Amino acid sequence: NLDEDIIAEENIVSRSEFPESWLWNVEDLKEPPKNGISTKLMNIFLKDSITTWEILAVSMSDKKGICVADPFEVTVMQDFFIDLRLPYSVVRNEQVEIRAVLYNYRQNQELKVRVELLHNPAFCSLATTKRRHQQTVTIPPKSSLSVPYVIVPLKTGLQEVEVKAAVYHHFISDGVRKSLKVVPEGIRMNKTVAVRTLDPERLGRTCNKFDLKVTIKPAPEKNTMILEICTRYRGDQDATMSILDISMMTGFAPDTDDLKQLANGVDRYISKYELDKAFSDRNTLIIYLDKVSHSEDDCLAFKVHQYFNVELIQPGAVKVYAYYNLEESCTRFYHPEKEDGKLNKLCRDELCRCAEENCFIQKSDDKVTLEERLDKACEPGVDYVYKTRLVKVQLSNDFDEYIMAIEQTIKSGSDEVQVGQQRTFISPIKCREALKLEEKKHYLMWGLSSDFWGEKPNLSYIIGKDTWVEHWPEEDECQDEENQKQCQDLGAFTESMVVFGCPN
Amino acid sequence: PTEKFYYIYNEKGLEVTITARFLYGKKVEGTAFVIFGIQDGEQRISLPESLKRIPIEDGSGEVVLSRKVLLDGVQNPRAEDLVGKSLYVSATVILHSGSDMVQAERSG
Amino acid sequence: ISLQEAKDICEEQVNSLPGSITKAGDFLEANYMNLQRSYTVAIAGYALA
Numbered sequence: 001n002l003d004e005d006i007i008a009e010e011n012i013v014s015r016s017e018f019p020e021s022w023l024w025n026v027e028d029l030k031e032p033p034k035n036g037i038s039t040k041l042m043n044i045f046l047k048d049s050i051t052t053w054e055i056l057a058v059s060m061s062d063k064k065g066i067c068v069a070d071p072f073e074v075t076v077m078q079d080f081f082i083d084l085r086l087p088y089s090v091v092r093n094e095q096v097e098i099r100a101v102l103y104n105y106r107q108n109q110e111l112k113v114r115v116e117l118l119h120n121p122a123f124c125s126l127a128t129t130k131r132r133h134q135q136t137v138t139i140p141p142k143s144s145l146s147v148p149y150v151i152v153p154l155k156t157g158l159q160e161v162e163v164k165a166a167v168y169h170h171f172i173s174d175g176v177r178k179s180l181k182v183v184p185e186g187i188r189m190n191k192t193v194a195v196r197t198l199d200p201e202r203l204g205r206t207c208n209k210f211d212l213k214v215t216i217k218p219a220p221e222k223n224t225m226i227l228e229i230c231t232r233y234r235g236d237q238d239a240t241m242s243i244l245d246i247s248m249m250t251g252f253a254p255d256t257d258d259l260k261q262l263a264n265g266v267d268r269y270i271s272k273y274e275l276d277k278a279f280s281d282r283n284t285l286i287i288y289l290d291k292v293s294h295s296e297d298d299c300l301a302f303k304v305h306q307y308f309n310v311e312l313i314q315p316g317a318v319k320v321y322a323y324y325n326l327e328e329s330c331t332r333f334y335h336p337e338k339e340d341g342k343l344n345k346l347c348r349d350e351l352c353r354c355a356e357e358n359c360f361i362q363k364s365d366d367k368v369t370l371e372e373r374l375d376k377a378c379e380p381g382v383d384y385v386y387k388t389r390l391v392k393v394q395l396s397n398d399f400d401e402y403i404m405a406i407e408q409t410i411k412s413g414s415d416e417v418q419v420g421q422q423r424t425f426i427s428p429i430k431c432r433e434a435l436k437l438e439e440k441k442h443y444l445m446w447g448l449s450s451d452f453w454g455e456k457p458n459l460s461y462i463i464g465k466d467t468w469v470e471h472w473p474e475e476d477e478c479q480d481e482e483n484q485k486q487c488q489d490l491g492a493f494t495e496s497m498v499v500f501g502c503p504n
Numbered sequence: 505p506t507e508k509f510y511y512i513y514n515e516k517g518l519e520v521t522i523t524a525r526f527l528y529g530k531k532v533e534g535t536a537f538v539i540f541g542i543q544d545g546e547q548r549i550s551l552p553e554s555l556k557r558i559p560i561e562d563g564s565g566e567v568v569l570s571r572k573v574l575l576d577g578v579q580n581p582r583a584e585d586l587v588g589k590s591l592y593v594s595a596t597v598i599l600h601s602g603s604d605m606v607q608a609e610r611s612g
Numbered sequence: 613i614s615l616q617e618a619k620d621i622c623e624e625q626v627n628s629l630p631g632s633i634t635k636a637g638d639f640l641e642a643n644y645m646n647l648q649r650s651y652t653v654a655i656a657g658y659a660l661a
């Protein structure tokens with residue numbers, strides 16, 4: 001709500017139609033001829049694709065015969081636009097990268113863009129339903145900028161991607177909306193033990209050319225960190241020119257002078273303009289190499305700076321390949337705390353869902369009364385509201401598991417819960433410490449029917465953006481005069497929830 | 505290439521003009537990967553020493569293969585066997601975006 | 613002589629070699645007569661051979 005002067009994403013008519021060919025038409029020449037020429041004028045529509053449209057035709061009159069024509073050229077474009085560049089054969093359930101190039105052919109006017117990668121439940125992105133992913137950027141006239149976007153194809157087939165870019169103090173917006181093919185792997189055979197109870201209850205009546213070790217480390221003395229790469233080739237003789245595509249964690253830029261220091265470096269070269277590009281939106285870097293070795297580790301490292309402060313940061317990406325071959329490439333993503341730089345998602349036998357939205361419903365608001373408390377408990381969404389005790393804890397890299405001890409079923413929902421039962425609630429590793437959670441403590445909790453992990457009775461629980469959790473002390477831990485106000489609203493919440501039940 | 509063929513005594517070696525342009529009608533700013541080779545009927549032989557990494561300037565470019573470099577490669581230095589052999593050129597250009605990539609070729 | 617012993621061997625992989633042989637032997641023939649000892653006489657005779 002900072003600035004009021006942009007076109008709402010909700011009103012950004014994207015580019016939609018991108019046929020690789022069309023107008024298979026067949027039209028007849030009824031016009032009264034002049035000069036021995038009937039003339040036809042077919043008013044048509046211009047597809048949402050920016051290219052010169054070549055037009056090829058053939059006149060089949062039975063009297064004179066066939067006749068090819070001089071192809072016709074209709075030159076289509078806008079001053080400022082996008083084109084989106086994707087792969088084709090992507091694999092479901094594997095984090096990938098895309099690049100979006102906005103071109104600006106305005107001769108003298110720079111531009112500031114707020115562009116959103118648009119949310120899609122078929123993809124694990126950074127864009128939740130409610131938490132937008134808007135990046136703000138600036139463009140030199142008669143220049144274009146490369147924007148990376150790393151995602152997870154959660155589903156198969158024809159998936160469309162959309163990105164809507166809107167501008168400030170000016171006119172146009174645009175949007176790309178482009179499909180491609182997603183497909184499955186099928187292995188699910190990673191270091192399985194002989195009987196791991198993977199099976200359900202109710203059924204039944206890759207870098208082959210390249211070594212690539214990338215690690216982003218921190219700096220000694222806004223914030224600057226180290227990027228480290230460590231590369232090799234696997235073959236009999238050393239290999240030809242290899243290329244690196246490197247992209248910046250949201251709002252990052254390298255150290256301009258260390259960049260310069262490295263380019264004079266042996267066996268290396270980065271042209272001047274991608275090397276004296278401006279600090280304003282210097283975001284994607286391409287470094288070409290003379291050759292790469294098959295014999296040992298030749299690493300590199302350099303600095304990165306934080307241009308804009310946002311709490312959450314897209315992983316950086318690094319894609320390396322031989323000059324001749326793109327398709328046998330190797331791609332790594334980095335993030336300092338995320339190992340191998342991969343987004344948090346949640347995975348079972350072949351399904352995954354994106355676990356990257358806010359840890360729990362936002363706390364610390366001025367309003368903590370029964371009035372709002374009940375309102376978020378009287379909503380229909382609330383399937384379950386429990387009060388348990390933090391009994392056990394499995395901590396791990398992926399997620400951190402809190403074993404909860406349900407003694408009472410306050411409001412079961414679509415759940416069949418017995419009394420004195422032990423059930424598994426999850427919280428992502430990015431959230432763990434923000435929760436300030438300790439075992440042996442009681443907790444009164446609630447969520448939705450949609451927020452249940454698994455199927456019965458081998459199920460689990462997930463704390464999401466709208467899950468509400470709060471610790472419950474003992475009787476000997478609420479007698480303090482300071483702790484009155486909490487334990488007051490706890491007693492009155494309970495009883496009026498209990499006696500009245502839900503209203504409906 | 506300047507002339508459709510390769511002149512055996514052309515001291516210049518070979519000067520090549522790279523034209524790279526967007527489909528919509530605008531010129532491209534970038535950098536190029538140029539590799540050549542020889543084809544003998546169905547038999548093609550790649551020419552590894554000639555690859556040049558070269559910039560692309562406002563939708564225009566020049567590259568030059570000096571005769572000195574050219575002749576160092578050759579296997580059998582000068583013979584009649586060489587005639588009947590044609591040349592093919594593979595071009596890989598990357599935008600300043602680092603994103604889009606095009607494979608191009610002049611053969612024959 | 614070490615180079616020319618394995619001639620017709622490194623002709624495919626390295627087409628630089630014949631130059632080093634020729635100009636080294638040229639340096640010999642123009643400046644072979646003006647030696648004193650027989651050792652140098654003998655070896656450089658053979659390489660021109």
Ligand SMILES: *[C@@H]1O[C@H](CO)[C@@H](O)[C@H](O)[C@H]1NC(C)=O
Pocket residue numbers: 187188190
């Ligand atoms: C294989 O196991 C590693 C951990 O050992 C994990 O990172 C990776 O996701 C697994 N791959 C598949 C396809 O399950």
